[PDB]
Structures are given as structure tokens and as C-alpha cells.
Design a protein around this ligand. Structure first.
Ligand SMILES: C[C@H](N)P(=O)(O)C[C@H](C)C(=O)O
Ligand SMILES: [Zn+2]
Ligand SMILES: [Zn+2]
Length: 351
């Protein structure tokens, strides 16, 4: 009785970036590490999701010193320097190239989808779906020319920033505890980026964007507001989470929030440790569902991007998560909404 899950955010492509020579095994067989691969997706009931193209900084997000800091709050991680298009583009092309390769290699068992109809068809057919997503828009120059290029080759979702400055605006540093109001809003280029994404029907992702940038998108975007992998600030006051005020704005826009499985954003203590139970997961889900409404919450795992609860552990833990959700009292129609229907509706409202 596992309900298929369509997911808001994963960083599986980073694993292919880091070991391209072994990609056939990593994707088609698994290599015994990480959260995702094709066989485990099938075992865990992963229907598909957003596959993030994210350009790492020289001190990557999982550098030892950062992990150690996040283990013992309070903490504040420094923002990395801006990466410009000339440097970001080859990396983004590499990751986009791996995503297309995944589809070639899987011989029809995985499909990069460009429309909501394709996603729904994949769901019905049991074919794993993928949405090409860019987490941080460094590969897009301020001129926006590359936005059209990436769109042409399948890009359908874009977060203007990661937790790092871009020509478009500013992301939050990783900090606990702290407000998401950590810096300046969108630049003029960022405002143009919002307008152009609206015109091209590219979904904008607010995860990582600071509060001023969030307010700018809320004011400027003609489309529902979406945070693909962010939780409730009122429960866990991480800079990465959403305040009730932000949630209310997302609700008004008929938007969507994906629950991030990152330990740091779920635990009330904001620690990185996987040693936790189901309570914090359900605490965030209840809070999100209560304020956003049952139609505006889903999963945003952050599989392969963060440490997640021991009870989930990897994609094969989705059934255990569903069991906890059911035990907590979520009925079947709500379960279907949270697992995939809400994302599919959001895609239709956006695209
Ligand atoms: C580094 C990854 N791409 P991430 O998806 O940015 C994981 C992180 C904990 C977050 O999402 O804030
Ligand atoms: Zn990511
Ligand atoms: Zn992220």
C-alpha cells in the first residue's frame, strides 16, 4: 500500500558530477552509497521528482568544517563568493548532460518531462519522471540569453539563488537560530529573471532565497509561489525555513511547499544528527498543512543533498515515512495529495 511519491528536490546529479566514470553503475545498479539510484527508487515507490543542477563552491556544502559546525548549534556558516556564468556554465552543462544520459541509459524506465501531461502519463505508466531544475542561476548571465537556451533543452524550474550571492539576488547563509531576513533583495537582473521565467512558464523556486528576495518574487511573479524544499520556521528557526507570514503569502498565491528531509531543518534544536524520530517530521507537516491548506504541501526530500532522519535513511524509507504519516491520522485522500497529487496540480497551475 505504498503510494507513489513525486518529490520536490534531489541532488542525485551531484553524485554523477563527482564520479562520472562510474555513472552506469551508480544510476542503473546503485553503488552502495547515498540516497537514490534507479533500483532503490523502484523499491521505495519514488514516482519521480525535480532533479537539481547545483554548482558547488570550492568549499562544497558538505566540506568537513561545515558539517562539524552544523552538528552543534548555534552556528552561522559564511557565504561563499559569487560564481559567474563563465565558470558555472560548464558545470551546469555537465549535470544537464548527465540527466539526459540517465534517460538514454535507462531505456524508457526514466523520462525527463517537459509538460504536466508527460508527468501524469509517467505516473500512470510507472515510469520514473524527472524535471530539470536549476538550483541557483549562476549559469544564466544577467542578459538572460542562457535562460532561453536552457529552456529549449528542457529546463522547467529555477531557483534564482542557492545559499550564495548571484547576479540576480541573495540567498540565506546557513544559520541557526536566525531569521530568513539575512540580506538584500533581488537585483534589477533578478526582477527581469522573474518576469522572463513567468513568460516562459518556468517555475520559480524560493528555497534558499532570503526574505527580501522572497518579498520581491511575491510582489512580481504572476505564478504560484513555490519553495521546493523548505520547512516551518515557527517549528525550527533555521534561516532556510519559512515564517508564518511567508506561508500566508504562499497560500494566497495557491502555491506549494515541499517538506525538506534535512535533519537541520526538521529538528526543533536545528542539529544535523540523523538520530531522531517521526515527531519532528509530523510537527512540520501539521504546521504546513494547517497554514497552507491540504492542497499546498508535498515532499521536497533533498535526497543526496543533506543528512536525513534515520527512520527514512534513503529513498527506500518512503514507505516507513508513509506508515508514520498514516498512524498520525492522515487519511488516504490527504496521503495522495501529500505524496504526489499536490505537485501535479502545482505543475498544471504553473506550466
Ligand atoms: C547542497 C545541496 N544542493 P542543498 O539542496 O542546498 C542541501 C541543503 C541542506 C539545503 O537545501 O539548504
Ligand atoms: Zn540541492
Ligand atoms: Zn537546497
Amino acid at each position: 500500500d505504498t503510494i507513489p511519491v513525486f518529490d520536490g528536490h534531489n541532488d542525485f546529479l551531484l553524485r554523477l558530477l563527482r564520479n562520472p566514470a562510474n555513472r552506469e553503475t551508480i544510476w542503473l545498479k546503485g553503488d552502495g552509497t547515498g540516497h537514490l539510484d534507479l533500483p532503490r527508487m523502484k523499491e521505495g515507490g519514488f514516482a519521480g521528482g525535480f532533479f537539481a543542477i547545483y554548482v558547488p563552491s570550492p568549499q562544497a556544502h558538505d566540506a568537513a568544517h561545515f558539517e562539524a559546525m552544523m552538528d552543534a548549534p548555534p552556528f552561522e556558516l559564511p557565504l561563499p563568493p559569487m560564481i559567474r556564468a563563465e565558470q558555472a556554465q560548464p558545470v551546469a552543462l555537465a549535470m544537464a548532460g548527465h540527466l539526459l544520459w540517465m534517460e538514454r541509459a535507462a531505456r524508457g524506465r526514466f523520462k525527463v518531462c517537459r509538460t504536466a501531461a508527460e508527468v501524469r502519463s509517467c505516473h500512470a505508466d510507472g515510469i520514473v519522471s524527472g524535471i530539470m531544475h536549476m538550483e541557483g542561476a549562476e549559469a544564466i548571465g544577467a542578459d538572460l540569453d542562457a535562460l532561453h537556451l536552457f529552456h529549449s533543452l528542457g529546463l522547467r524550474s529555477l531557483g534564482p539563488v542557492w545559499s550564495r550571492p548571484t547576479v540576480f539576488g541573495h540567498g540565506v547563509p546557513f544559520r541557526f537560530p536566525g531569521s530568513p531576513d539575512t540580506g538584500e533583495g533581488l537585483t534589477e537582473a533578478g526582477r527581469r529573471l522573474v518576469a522572463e521565467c513567468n513568460r516562459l512558464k518556468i517555475m520559480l523556486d524560493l528555497s534558499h532565497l532570503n526574505e527580501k528576495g522572497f518579498d520581491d518574487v511575491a510582489r512580481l511573479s504572476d505564478a504560484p509561489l513555490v519553495a521546493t524544499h523548505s520547512n516551518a520556521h515557527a517549528v525550527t528557526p533555521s534561516t532556510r525555513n519559512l515564517t508564518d507570514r511567508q506561508l500566508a503569502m504562499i497560500r494566497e498565491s495557491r502555491g506549494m511547499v515541499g517538506l525538506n528531509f534535512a535533519t537541520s531543518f526538521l529538528r526543533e534544536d536545528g542539529r544535523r544528527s540523523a538520530e531522531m524520530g517521526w515527531e519532528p517530521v509530523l510537527r512540520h507537516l501539521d504546521h504546513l498543512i494547517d497554514r497552507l491548506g491540504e492542497d499546498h504541501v508535498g515532499m521536497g526530500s533533498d535526497f543526496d543533498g543533506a543528512t536525513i532522519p534515520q527512520g527514512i535513511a534513503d529513498v527506500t524509507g518512503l514507505p516507513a515515512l508513509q506508515a508514520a504519516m498514516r498512524a498520525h491520522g492522515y487519511d488516504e485522500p490527504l496521503m495522495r495529495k501529500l505524496c504526489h497529487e499536490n505537485w501535479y496540480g502545482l505543475l498544471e497551475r504553473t506550466w
